[PDB]
Amino acid sequence: SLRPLYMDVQATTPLDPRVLDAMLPYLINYYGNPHSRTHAYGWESEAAMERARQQVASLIGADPREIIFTSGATESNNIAIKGVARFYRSRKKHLITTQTEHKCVLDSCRSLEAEGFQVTYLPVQKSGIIDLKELEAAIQPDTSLVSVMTVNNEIGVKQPIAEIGRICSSRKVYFHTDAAQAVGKIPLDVNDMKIDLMSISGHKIYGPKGVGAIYIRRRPRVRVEALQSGGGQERGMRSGTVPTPLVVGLGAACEVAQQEMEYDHKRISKLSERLIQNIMKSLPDVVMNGDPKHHYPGCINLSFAYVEGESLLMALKDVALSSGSACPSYVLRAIGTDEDLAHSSIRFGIGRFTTEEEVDYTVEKCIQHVKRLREMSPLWEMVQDGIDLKSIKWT
Amino acid sequence: SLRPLYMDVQATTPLDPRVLDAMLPYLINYYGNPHSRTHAYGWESEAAMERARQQVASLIGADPREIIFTSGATESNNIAIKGVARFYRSRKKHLITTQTEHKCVLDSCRSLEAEGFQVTYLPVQKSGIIDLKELEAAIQPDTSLVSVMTVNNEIGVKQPIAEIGRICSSRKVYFHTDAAQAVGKIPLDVNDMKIDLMSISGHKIYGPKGVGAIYIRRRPRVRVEALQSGGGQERGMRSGTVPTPLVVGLGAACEVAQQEMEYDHKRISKLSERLIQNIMKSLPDVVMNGDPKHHYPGCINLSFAYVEGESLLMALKDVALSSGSACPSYVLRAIGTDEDLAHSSIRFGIGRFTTEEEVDYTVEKCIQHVKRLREMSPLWEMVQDGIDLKSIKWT
Amino acid sequence: TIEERVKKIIGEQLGVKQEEVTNNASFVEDLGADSLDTVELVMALEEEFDTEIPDEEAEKITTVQAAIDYINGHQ
Amino acid sequence: TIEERVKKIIGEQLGVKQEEVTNNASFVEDLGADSLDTVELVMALEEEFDTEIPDEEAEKITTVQAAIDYINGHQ
Amino acid sequence: AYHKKVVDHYENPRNVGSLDKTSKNVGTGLVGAPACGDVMKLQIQVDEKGKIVDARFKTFGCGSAIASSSLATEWVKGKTVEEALTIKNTDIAKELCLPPVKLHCSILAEDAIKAALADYKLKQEP
Amino acid sequence: AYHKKVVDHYENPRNVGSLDKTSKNVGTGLVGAPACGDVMKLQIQVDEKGKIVDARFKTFGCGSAIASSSLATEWVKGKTVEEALTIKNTDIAKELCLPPVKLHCSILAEDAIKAALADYKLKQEP
Amino acid sequence: AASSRAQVLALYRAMLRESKRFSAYNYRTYAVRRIRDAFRENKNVKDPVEIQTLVNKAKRDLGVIRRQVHIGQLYSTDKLIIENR
Amino acid sequence: AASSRAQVLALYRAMLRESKRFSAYNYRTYAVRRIRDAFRENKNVKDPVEIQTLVNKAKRDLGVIRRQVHIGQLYSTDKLIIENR
Numbered sequence A, B: 001s002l003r004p005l006y007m008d009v010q011a012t013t014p015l016d017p018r019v020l021d022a023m024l025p026y027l028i029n030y031y032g033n034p035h036s037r038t039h040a041y042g043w044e045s046e047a048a049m050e051r052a053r054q055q056v057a058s059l060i061g062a063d064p065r066e067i068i069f070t071s072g073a074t075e076s077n078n079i080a081i082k083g084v085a086r087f088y089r090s091r092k093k094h095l096i097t098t099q100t101e102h103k104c105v106l107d108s109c110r111s112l113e114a115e116g117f118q119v120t121y122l123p124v125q126k127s128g129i130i131d132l133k134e135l136e137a138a139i140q141p142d143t144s145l146v147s148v149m150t151v152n153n154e155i156g157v158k159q160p161i162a163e164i165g166r167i168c169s170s171r172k173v174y175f176h177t178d179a180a181q182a183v184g185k186i187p188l189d190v191n192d193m194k195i196d197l198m199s200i201s202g203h204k205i206y207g208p209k210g211v212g213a214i215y216i217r218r219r220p221r222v223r224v225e226a227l228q229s230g231g232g233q234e235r236g237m238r239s240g241t242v243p244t245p246l247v248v249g250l251g252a253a254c255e256v257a258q259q260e261m262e263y264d265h266k267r268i269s270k271l272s273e274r275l276i277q278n279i280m281k282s283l284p285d286v287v288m289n290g291d292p293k294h295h296y297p298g299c300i301n302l303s304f305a306y307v308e309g310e311s312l313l314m315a316l317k318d319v320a321l322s323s324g325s326a327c328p329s330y331v332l333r334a335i336g337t338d339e340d341l342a343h344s345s346i347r348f349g350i351g352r353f354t355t356e357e358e359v360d361y362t363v364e365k366c367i368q369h370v371k372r373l374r375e376m377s378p379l380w381e382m383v384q385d386g387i388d389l390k391s392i393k394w395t
Numbered sequence C, D: 001t002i003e004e005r006v007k008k009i010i011g012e013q014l015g016v017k018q019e020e021v022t023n024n025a026s027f028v029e030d031l032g033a034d035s036l037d038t039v040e041l042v043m044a045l046e047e048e049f050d051t052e053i054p055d056e057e058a059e060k061i062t063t064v065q066a067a068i069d070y071i072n073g074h075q
Numbered sequence E, F: 001a002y003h004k005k006v007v008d009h010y011e012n013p014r015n016v017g018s019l020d021k022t023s024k025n026v027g028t029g030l031v032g033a034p035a036c037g038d039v040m041k042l043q044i045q046v047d048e049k050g051k052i053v054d055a056r057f058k059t060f061g062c063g064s065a066i067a068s069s070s071l072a073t074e075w076v077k078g079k080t081v082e083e084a085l086t087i088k089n090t091d092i093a094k095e096l097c098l099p100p101v102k103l104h105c106s107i108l109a110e111d112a113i114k115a116a117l118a119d120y121k122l123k124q125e126p
Numbered sequence G, H: 001a002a003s004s005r006a007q008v009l010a011l012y013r014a015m016l017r018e019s020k021r022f023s024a025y026n027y028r029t030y031a032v033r034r035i036r037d038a039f040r041e042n043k044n045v046k047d048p049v050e051i052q053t054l055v056n057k058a059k060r061d062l063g064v065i066r067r068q069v070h071i072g073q074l075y076s077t078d079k080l081i082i083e084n085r
């Protein structure tokens, strides 16, 4: 039967055809191991790997020697957080992060707390943004690392990465950012932002799944204890066979994004404004989660009061969306969303290939089915009869 | 210009066209995240992931619930060795492995020795095979894990996996095998061999790079502490996004190998005998490294006395081969090879797509260039004049 | 809805009121088209009338009536 | 090396000495071919003489002389 | 959300609505909590012989909650009050083929039946 | 192994061979060790005016070792013994574009020149 | 010397015609829109070297479109809900 | 009812003809050899259900060969040294 519209780009993206085109030769005749040093299959694969490394470096303003390939931003987040913590553990035992980070950062930090490290999970404002002055105050003499993500995967809000870099640089604390939802989307420059480590995911930027990278600053030198033991590939930081076709795809996705970022941001901004404005002018009690003043337009998280989010996703049977989603939501809890409204939130994703027709269809169906589910809702019935839900003794 | 013959399958394999055909739909229109639970892109990707899990399980005799997808056998080896050691560290601090294991097993064990664990690196016989009675003697009351690889990546020799399983099962010690060079090549059955953990690499079996699996026995339950923190994918054992196209390719490669194993083994055995016999009948002082009675025929490691191996690889300019290679060799040292002969060894790989014409060309060029390099060699000149090299005071 | 669906296509493509799409009008000189627009306009006529317009014929379709005449002469 | 390169192809394909590849011989009845062999033999004649042999002609090429005759009649 | 049997109760709604809470022959059950993501209102209408002759529901909750409460509402019709008391969460789950992570939906729907029946019974004591 | 300049000394060999070790005008240098993977034999022939008029080499070693020793053998011809003493490992490496992991090859080739020259000088003392 | 305008208008027609053959809605609609927007954006470039660079990039992208249209036809799937109504 | 022998001999010719179009030496030589060996190996199967299964597998593999031959032509490379001499 006919397929649903894809409006779920923060979970993953389709491959850009330019990226699959760049990868295919390595899946067909250039199948050598990039670490085979004694023959042309190895030489050509190594050369493709190094070209891709330069493409990743160029997008973020790095030197290629600072780019380490990984299997995804999950692995990159583990290397940055556990790798820095373990390296400086003789002198430093404290790390700082936020309450709205992706699960791999939070669970890496939890694992370190079981290893005897101290972790401060900073709260965020209701905007979703951290308080820079609270970050400054939390830094201790034995703080080794601050980790704050560039763009949030559930609500799309942008942390003040350059200002955090200023704070960390000035105190000689390493600064990591999980940039998986920001890379090729908003400008990133590791020197202007004073970043020491950065996580990158290929499948969030029209590249293939199974690949990512970690930027590790070389001047001033950032030290990381490697997590994956082996023969010393990737400068000893990530042993194992570098998967040439996937890293070719990651580099191609980075080069395409470097060229298309401004065009996409203009187009996605317009579609995002259209979606939010046309839903809000047609439905009462719709709230955007996250501050629109510091927000990436392709990730739109709205609450529809009196309707539960999973039932709305079921109702929108021909649109692929997500709810309380990591790429009862802990991110919505952290920004102070009422628990019932957090059960009423949906995430809409707009990306490089989204059309105005898809946005308009999604808007029209959302308006129709929010009204339908409200007509089925006992909470809407009670408020329509003037009952204050905050006065009921539930269960 | 014209391309060299690929005779280096232990470093990596080309993709089987059947495997690339199975992967392509997931690189073009089935690009959903297998963890997206609320829409058809996710459902179809999840279903493809679970079908691939069953294909891997069927090849090794496992239940699909015992298959965890990883980025490669390097990661699988780290999970098995560090994961078991860390889980049982309250009661057990000793692990056993061998001196000829791949670098990821050896370096994982070295990292654990720095964590305060005790590791016995068993020696092997001159055949390359371990002494089963020496293994039995090395097991201590606090031994948590034995790790011994099924097929060696440099010399191709087969360890007595079923007999090691008997030993470990009877002592309630977990048994891991790195099967990266054995899976889809020789029969593997986890219950008949009494295996508790097994590492699998997709790119050694005509599958894509960047993917692997680890078998973790569920009855009796084997416990492993996870290494990659995150949202709990793969039953909490390997967090991160499962890369649907790559795991589809791994499952397809396993199903194709299950169907082609007997045909390939017969064909590769014949080509391997041809290569070894025709080189040895035409050149003096050629020695096979590893016992031919316990050996996988597709991996042939020979020494050519009086010629250095890298110069022979350079001379064989149109054949892709490798020397002192991990998929002065520590494996050759461990089997007692004289250091000079270990500098004289080459690895030839014969796989599913190798032709008799390629074997004959390689043999003919090897004979020609060993003779040429011997005519350039001062060591050959000295032996031809009756000098005993073992009587010279070198440097 | 005669074959002066041609006029509807020209007006839509060039952002010109149906009133100003006169039979004598040149796309470039009279309706403000550039040559990117006229490539697109020819393709839009190919699409609407399920017809192929090769380069030597496309080069002659420079006015409303030339478009009308071509489509009438090709079923 | 006349067009009785046809005999060389038949002998090679069917493992039969050139002496036993007589003009009157049927591939199946006289030279021990099965129908997998005769598919391959027809393709080998197509390859050697750069000629296409479609199914209704291939079905009639069942003897050495029928092969010889077909190739002589197709340049 | 996915199961055809569950989605049917949303795409083809039946008995959605309200009954008169002031009636001595209406029982109203309101169970769950907005903060838990599932609130079910189930109302039953009982004739003077004790037979349930009609029922209505409204639910805030996932598709499986809507289907569980919708199915409960269909199932109580034509049953006596004592009969309806024997509808089990496990029958609702079986009918809808609920996976284990959604079994709490069939439990809440059974709680809604019993709260409606209890409310009706309270009203009959005079 | 890869560099065109290195491979040339194997594909197009020159001066491979031996000179008469018993000659008072031949110096023989044998340096390196089989266990280290690199053994170079370099022989020089010197005329009665002290000019090196011919040279030969044999080498067991990787392509860069063969090229380094082959180039040394070409370079000593036409040089006086004192001139040949000033050939440096760094000139050999530069000519062949050796990467750092192969610089030890140019060092051994310089050692071979000096061992051959030293052997010749020893022979002239009577 | 080749005519930059003739290359440009020939490439524009060819790229749009080939992009319309993408089986997948999201690649087809993106490629057609992107081509229209890029040629219009670059209409007033005057430097002949820069024009030549843009033409060479377009020729490269036409090869990509041709191959990826073919691959997408070999592995096609159902249409999207909105391609009906 | 379809003739199993006619399907089999038609598929054998078609699979061999298509496999000979593989641009890459190692896929071409493997596919031709494997097809010859598999049909010969299965020559004496007598169970009509098992024959039908094998025929269906061959039809599936002919689709794979067709697509992978085309993909390998779109992304072809130089020949191997031994394809010269």
Ligand SMILES: *P(=O)(O)OCC(C)(C)[C@@H](O)C(=O)NCCC(=O)NCCSC(=O)CCCCCCCCCCC
Binding pocket: A017, A018, C034, C035, C036, G004, G005, G008, G009, G031, G034, G035, G038, G039, G042, G043, G044, G045, G046, G051, G054, G055, G057, G058, G061, G064, G065
């Ligand atoms: P007409 O009005 O007579 O003339 C129009 C032109 C453009 C020819 C005229 O204005 C002119 O000559 N301008 C000079 C500058 C110029 O030539 N600009 C065009 C250069 S080519 C170009 O810009 C191509 C950009 C390629 C975009 C491809 C995007 C593909 C995406 C595919 C993804 C899968």
Ligand SMILES: *P(=O)(O)OCC(C)(C)[C@@H](O)C(=O)NCCC(=O)NCCSC(=O)CCCCCCCCCCC
Binding pocket: B017, B018, D034, D035, D036, H004, H005, H008, H009, H031, H034, H035, H038, H039, H042, H043, H044, H045, H046, H051, H054, H055, H057, H058, H061, H064, H065
């Ligand atoms: P002829 O002698 O009249 O008849 C020959 C046949 C085989 C038709 C005759 O013997 C017969 O009818 N036998 C009955 C059994 C039978 O039909 N066997 C054949 C079944 S089909 C088969 O075996 C196909 C196997 C497919 C192999 C494909 C390998 C592809 C690899 C590609 C990789 C990229």
Ligand SMILES: O=C(O)CN(CCN(CC(=O)O)CC(=O)O)CC(=O)O
Binding pocket: A357, G020, G021, G025, G028, G029, G032, G033, G079, G082, G083, G084
């Ligand atoms: O040019 C475009 O933007 C896309 N399409 C039209 C896209 N269609 C979908 C379809 O034709 O099935 C739009 C739609 O129906 O929504 C051109 C073409 O069909 O060749």
Ligand SMILES: O=C(O)CN(CCN(CC(=O)O)CC(=O)O)CC(=O)O
Binding pocket: B357, H020, H021, H025, H028, H029, H032, H033, H079, H082, H083, H084
């Ligand atoms: O059928 C086969 O086994 C392969 N080839 C022949 C393989 N050739 C290589 C070539 O034709 O370039 C063999 C060779 O030259 O080594 C058939 C074909 O060319 O269509």
Ligand SMILES: *Cc1c(COP(=O)(O)O)cnc(C)c1O
Binding pocket: A010, A071, A072, A073, A074, A075, A077, A102, A104, A149, A151, A152, A153, A178, A179, A180, A181, A200, A201, A202, A203, A204, A211, A212, A327, B240, B241
């Ligand atoms: C997707 C994502 C990740 C994980 O990336 P993978 O490449 O899937 O491992 C990490 N952080 C954020 C913010 C993400 O959106």
Ligand SMILES: *Cc1c(COP(=O)(O)O)cnc(C)c1O
Binding pocket: A240, A241, B010, B071, B072, B073, B074, B075, B077, B102, B104, B149, B151, B152, B153, B178, B179, B180, B181, B200, B201, B202, B203, B204, B211, B212, B327
């Ligand atoms: C190749 C190989 C590995 C590593 O596998 P990857 O999938 O490349 O990480 C491990 N063990 C052996 C024996 C190998 O040959």
